[PDB]
Paper text:
The SARS-CoV-2 main or 3C-like protease (Mpro or 3CLpro) is essential for viral replication and is a promising drug target. The Mpro inhibitor, nirmatrelvir, is the antiviral component of Paxlovid, an orally available treatment for COVID-19. The E166 residue is known to be a potential hot spot for drug resistance and yeast assays identified substitutions which conferred strong nirmatrelvir resistance and others that compromised activity. As the E166 site appears to be a hot spot for drug resistance from in vitro viral evolution experiments, we solved the structures of two substitution mutants Mpro E166N and Mpro E166R, revealing how E166 mutations may compromise activity versus drug resistance, respectively.
Using this assay, we found that compared to wild-type, the E166R mutation conferred strong nirmatrelvir resistance (Ki > 1000-fold). However, the Mpro E166R mutant conferred a growth reduction that matched the wild-type Mpro, suggesting that its catalytic activity was intact. But both nirmatrelvir and GC-376 have the same pyrrolidone side chain placed in the S1 site where E166 is located. The GC-376 complex can thus offer important insights into how E166 mutations may impact the binding of ligands with similar chemical structures, including nirmatrelvir. In contrast, the longer and positively charged R166 side chain in the Mpro E166R mutant does not interact with H163, but rather extends into the solvent. Therefore, the S1 site is open for substrate binding. The E166R mutation would abolish this direct HB with the substrate or inhibitor, resulting in the pyrrolidone ring of GC-376 forming an alternative weak HB with F140 backbone carbonyl group (3.1 Å in length) in the mutant complex structure. The E166R mutation eliminates the salt bridge with the N-terminus of the adjacent protomer, and further introduces electrostatic repulsion leading to small yet significant changes in the N-terminus conformation. Consequently, the distance between the N-terminal amine group and the F140 carbonyl group increased from 2.6 Å in the WT to 3.7 Å in the Mpro E166R mutant, diminishing the HB. The crystal structure of E166R with GC-376 revealed loss of key hydrogen bonds with the pyrrolidone ring of GC-376 which can explain the increase in resistance to nirmatrelvir containing the same functional group.
Numbering used by the authors:
A (entry chain A), B (entry chain A): 1 to 305
Write the structure that this text describes.
Amino acid sequence: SGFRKMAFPSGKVEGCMVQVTCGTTTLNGLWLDDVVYCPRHVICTSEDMLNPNYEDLLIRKSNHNFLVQAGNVQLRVIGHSMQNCVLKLKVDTANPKTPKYKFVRIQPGQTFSVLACYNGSPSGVYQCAMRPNFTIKGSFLNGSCGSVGFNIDYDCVSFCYMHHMRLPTGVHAGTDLEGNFYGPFVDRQTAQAAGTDTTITVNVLAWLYAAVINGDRWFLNRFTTTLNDFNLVAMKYNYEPLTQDHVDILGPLSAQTGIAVLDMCASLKELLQNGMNGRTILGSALLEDEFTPFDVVRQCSGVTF
Amino acid sequence: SGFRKMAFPSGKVEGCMVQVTCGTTTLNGLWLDDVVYCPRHVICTSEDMLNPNYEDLLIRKSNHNFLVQAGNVQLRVIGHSMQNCVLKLKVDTANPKTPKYKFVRIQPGQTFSVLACYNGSPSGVYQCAMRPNFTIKGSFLNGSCGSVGFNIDYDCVSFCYMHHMRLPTGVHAGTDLEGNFYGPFVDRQTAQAAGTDTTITVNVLAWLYAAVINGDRWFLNRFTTTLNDFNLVAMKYNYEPLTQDHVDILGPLSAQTGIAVLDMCASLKELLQNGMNGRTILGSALLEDEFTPFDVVRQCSGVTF
Ligand SMILES: *[C@H](O)[C@H](C[C@@H]1CCNC1=O)NC(=O)[C@H](CC(C)C)NC(=O)OCc1ccccc1
Ligand SMILES: *[C@H](O)[C@H](C[C@@H]1CCNC1=O)NC(=O)[C@H](CC(C)C)NC(=O)OCc1ccccc1
């Protein structure tokens, strides 16, 4: 009963968050073993962030110019390197709280939990989808940079995101933990924008399933459709073209509800062409695309860690 | 930038979650010092839960009939008592992870984070409002009972909720940590229902402020109103009557936006009488009442712990 946007528990990552200061610039860092990971723009003055030469800017920096603080304890920096748009600081101490972990580049459409941090302290936790245009719709204020997104598979933390910037639209962009941006973004204060965002069709269908399961069904019709004719309608609404692989992935939900995917696709086409007429689904007056098929299964199968 | 429903970080509470088995019934418990707290219906067979005599049912139970497990470690139960609808098990070990904590009965309209647990393992974290009818709209499956809701004030965990039941509507009911239900609910499988829910007006206004701040303003009109005439309209829409105290509480937001509360009330009346015409606010096609004025300030003032 109930379907909520749910974040993973944040304890494991909470113990990996530190504060990194370089001059006047303070942001957050991720401490795993004897390496702290942070956005490289920590080394920029306010002037620099219009058109920085990070190679040249780091050349003038030494280990002692990096102030890293865990709680009130200061870590000694004993080496530094730049990997893409992230800085790896080698420290004298390995994090005793280092969890089992992995670094994963995540695919668009996929979800993760974000631990929003300021001054190396956890502020709060929310779940996000990597949007098709490689932006995320988060809540990040200044000081949030170096906050990370993650998944937990039983015991293993899979870090997929580190925060670097907001775009004029008020959306957010960042890197994987190897410092490669998701999307065509660069760490400079220039005119930057993301493409057209698409609705993640596979994720909307899954959310429709979650509804049936929770007892919302008004939207169910008496018709079916064909993938191709469904997508003709998808095109016009900026919904992602649905594939056979998608249909396979929804198979578990289809099975547990006894609703064929293409019957649900017919339901969806009606909502796109007819709206929800003031009616709501799982208490949303719009269609939600930020729930993965798996997110739904887990939440409707009570999976823990 | 961005406004998201945000849960507190769950690390501190994660270390207080245990599994409690009594016969065939397993649910979660909260371990603080040498006391584990759990719902008393753990002592019920499936037959018992239609009309249980908890006094009589506990009389037949001994300390050794309670299996409490932290991780894989079993705790020895050395005493038991029933306080309202919660059981306090005294154990041989005090939780070494016991955080600074408090037990608070929360007021309707107020929010908290829930750590959803199964078999004493954290599954995930979400934020909830205590609704005026003293229900919550959560995601709880069987095994979730003994999961708790909490706030964190810097260092102090303020536990306000423990989960016991779902109602036919698919909403949820539970107790404070002294075992007193919120609302007129009882722990039996009987026909039970909550009253009419009201929209938490103060919280909707705050969310409107959060929007302005994030750049959504279409809804702003060229008029004002009076508390009394606003509420005449509130009445009809099952919105909570707004008070002067409410207006005082929104004062900080009013000030930072330069929008008087009563001008915003005029905006609100138009949306109630005219709808949002397919338009959205902070990407919601409806009005959100599950954000406290404070929740907004914190999220728009980047407060941590
Ligand atoms: C790092 O914490 C900060 C977070 C931004 C600040 C406002 N909301 C956020 O998410 N990011 C930056 O300062 C970033 C630094 C560049 C050198 C990558 N600049 C940026 O995000 O530009 C957009 C911006 C808009 C409004 C205020 C500040 C920055
Ligand atoms: C405790 O984990 C369980 C959680 C319920 C089960 C389904 N969704 C939930 O939140 N609560 C109970 O089992 C509770 C026990 C009574 C003796 C208090 N019974 C209950 O919630 O009745 C309603 C119900 C509806 C549908 C399935 C199961 C129970």
